[PDB]
Each structure stands twice: as C-alpha cells, then as structure tokens.
Symmetry: C2
Subunit: 213 residues, 2 copies
C-alpha cells in the first residue's frame, strides 16, 4: 500500500514555523488554495489547446469547497491538471524549494505571512488552520494517489483505494484545528472568497448541507 518520504529540511522547518505561528490573518490560507486551484485549471485548459482529449476525463472546469462539519474537515476540489505519484513525491516535499529559506528570512525580519504566495510556497499556508492534510489527486497520466502530512519530518503517499474517483484533478482535505472551525461555515467561507478571490476565471462552488424543514 503505503510509502514514506522525507521532507527536505527547510520545508520541515517552514511547516514548523507556520503551524506554530500566532498570526492574526489566517484566512489567507483559502486565498492560496483557491489560487493554486486556478493555477491548475489554467494548466490543463492550456494543455488541451493542443490536445482536446485531455479535458474528456472531466469536461467541467470548476473549484468546489465542501465543509464537512461532522468530521472537522474542509475540502477544496478542482478539476485541474492533477499530479502523478512522482509529482506528489518530488513537488510536495522531497526536493528543496527555491523560496523556503528566503521566506523564512523575510518572516523573521517582519514580513506579513500574507506574502507566502509570492515566495511560491503558499501551499504550506494551510498549516495556519490545519494539523493534517490529505492531497488526493488524479492526473490523466496516473492512478489516483493520497499524499498525507501532519507537519512532521515526513509524509506518506498511498495508492487511493479509499476515496471517490476524481475524474481528474485534486482535492485538498484539511483536518482543521479546534480553534479554526470558523472555516466550516457558509457565511465565513463566502466572506473570505469575496475579500481575497474576486478575480478568478472559474466558477467557485460551495457545497452546503441543510436539514430539510
């Protein structure tokens, strides 16, 4: 089933920094994850200009937020390009990232966490509000895989026999911290999107569950 990999050292260090910070504007994590989703929709949409059959696995291009209050979990879905087993491994931890040290140096010098995205390491901002992540992803070029981290020194990557089938793309499964359940609520989610994600080319769907009156 399930392989384990080592985080490059500064990535550990940065995650540890973020997860431990008192910062007062953690809502930016959603700006980042939405903007990553958009970057991945862009990428597949562009790819299919020269290869239209790439869109076939999943014709609709969207971003979808799903609060799961009962599980203390928030999910950000996209029908973007997705990632293969080897891209999860390389790009999410094992290799040194061009901005990690520079950002941490900026941070300790006074910089706002908000700036994370400009150092190209804004995926790690999710730890502002979550102590476990699953990245579940299906690329047109591979089977569906689950990448998991708890901010420790290592992560796991497992063949997905367990979750619904993504036609194509990626789900970010955030297990929220108990002092961050504000991000489970419709009003809150809507506000953060309004404020920080006005200029997004793709529909952003919110999946909401109400008991029938």
């Amino acid at each position: 089933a399930s392989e384990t990999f080592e985080f490059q050292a500064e990535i550990t260090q940065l995650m540890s920094l973020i997860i431990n910070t008192v910062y007062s504007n953690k809502e930016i994590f959603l700006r980042e994850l939405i903007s990553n989703a958009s970057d991945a929709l862009d990428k597949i949409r562009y790819k299919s200009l020269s290869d239209p059959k790439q869109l076939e696995t999943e014709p609709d291009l969207f971003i979808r937020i799903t609060p799961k209050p009962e599980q203390k979990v928030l999910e950000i879905r996209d029908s973007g390009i997705g990632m293969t087993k080897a891209e999860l491994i390389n790009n999410l931890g094992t290799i040194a990232k061009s901005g990690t040290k520079a950002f941490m140096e900026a941070l300790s010098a006074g910089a706002d966490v908000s700036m994370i995205g400009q150092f190209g390491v804004g995926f790690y901002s999710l730890f502002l509000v979550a102590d476990r992540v699953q990245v579940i992803s299906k690329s047109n070029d591979d089977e569906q895989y689950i990448w998991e981290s708890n901010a420790g020194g290592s992560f796991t990557v497992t063949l997905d026999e367990v979750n619904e089938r993504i036609g194509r793309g990626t789900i970010l499964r955030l297990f929220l911290k108990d002092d961050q359940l504000e991000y489970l609520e419709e009003k809150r989610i809507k506000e953060v999107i309004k404020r920080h994600s006005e200029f997004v080319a793709y529909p952003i769907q919110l999946v909401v569950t109400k008991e029938v009156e």
Copy 2:
C-alpha cells in the same frame, strides 16, 4: 473483482413491468427509499440497545439526499445497518420474494403502483425513474460492496475500491432517466418529502451545491 448473479424470474418480470410503466405518480419512489432508510436506521439503533459499540463506526443517524446534476444521478444515503456481501446477494434478487407475483397480479387488476411498499417490494420502485442502480453498502460485519443492476436478468456485486468510505450504511445511487431529471432540483425534492415523508424519526439532509455569488 466482480461476480455476476441471476435475478429470480418474477423479480426480472416485475422490474421489467415497473421500468416500462406510464404511471403518473413516480415521485413515490422517493417515499419508498426514504422509508427503507428509516427501516435501516431503526434496525441499527435497536441492535445497539444491547450492543452500543455498534454505533461507533458512525455515531450520527441521518438520511442524506445528494443530487449530482452533472452526472444525471441522485444519491440517497443512510447511516443504517447496511448489508453484507451475502445479504446483497440473497436479499436483492437471487431469492424469490414473498410479494412479487401478488403485486403484479394486483397491478394488472387495477391497483395503484403506490401500493408497492405494502407488498414489501418497494425497493424496485426506483426503476420508475432510473435505468441503472448502484447499491453501495457497508455493514459493521463486512467490507464495503457495490451491487449494480440495469433491470436486466442479472446483477453484479463487486468489492468497492472506488467510492468514498461509508463509516456504516448504504447509498442508493440512482442514474436517472432523461425524462425524470426533475428529481435533481431542490424545490422538487423538498415537495416530495413534505407530501409523502412527514412522519420520519431521523433528520433528512439535502446536500446542495450553489456557485458563490
């Protein structure tokens, strides 16, 4: 992966009858599926009176409707007792049912389809509005399985490596007919529940997806 089984002969016959009928009150299929859900919630709730650890796999007791417009699919979820591989096989087709012939005889004599549930064969009413069903189920006593039918002479039962994990219970996955997509819409669903499912002990949740304004 995937075994195939034979429908007992009258069950085929009845399915063929239902799927082919012009009947003007097909909405009753939802009454039936909700009431089955309730029968399965009852059953686990009762079981755990003498065995409280049975509720642990899924503490919440609910029924959940999820329209999937993009897929022409409606899902009815319950956290009831669920079914094992052997119960799917026995109880959903292979063995002769006590009411099948009697109901078909009632039908051709004038009876309203609405009466199906009183012959204890109301599960088959789903074919009024669907030409494919998946029954995905997880019983505390077995792995999660998928039972599939297209109203033909046979059905399949496959180990589930493909759908999200039910802690416990059952999802009815209806693939609706093109002239029955009315059941994908919030207003419609709500109306049918109001009319036919007033007296239900369990919360009925409706999962709705709206694009953010």
